[PDB]
Amino acid sequence: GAMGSSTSGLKTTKIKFYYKDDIFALMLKGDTTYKELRSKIAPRIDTDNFKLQTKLFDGSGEEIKTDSQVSNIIQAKLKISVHDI
């Protein structure tokens, strides 16, 4: 009894967000999303509306706003920045 199929998994990417002067982290297994992060950040922000970006050296880069921007910060492990909105 053998099988050719196989469980396909990925490696949780460590992404440190930067809400104001505080910062947190997130482990994305690849199934995460932008609306997923929305609930994973809201509670770590103290609010329900904030703006995530690719924490650059100036302050923020492409404001993550789509499951792709997140899966991108996921495949590239980008430090995220969080603002209050």
Side-chain angles (χ1 to χ4, degrees), residues 42-57:
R44 299 246 152 77
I45 308 230
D46 311 318
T47 167
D48 88 317
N49 252 230
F50 28 100
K51 352 169 68 179
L52 315 330
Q53 318 118 127
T54 27
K55 209 284 208 272
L56 294 174
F57 103 85

Side-chain angles (χ1 to χ4, degrees), residues 1-2 11 19-20 22 27 34-35 40 42-43 45-46 48-49 51 53 56 59 62 64 66 71-72 81-83:
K11 256 225 200 140
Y19 185 54
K20 320 220 67 172
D22 276 5
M27 307 249 52
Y34 171 82
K35 288 184 285 221
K40 305 182 225 244
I45 308 230
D46 311 318
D48 88 317
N49 252 230
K51 352 169 68 179
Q53 318 118 127
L56 294 174
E62 283 289 329
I64 311 109
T66 41
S71 312
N72 205 80
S81 168
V82 203
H83 296 265

Side-chain angles (χ1 to χ4, degrees), residues 19-33:
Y19 185 54
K20 320 220 67 172
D21 294 17
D22 276 5
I23 277 132
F24 32 110
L26 226 87
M27 307 249 52
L28 305 320
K29 200 141 206 71
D31 54 20
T32 350
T33 111

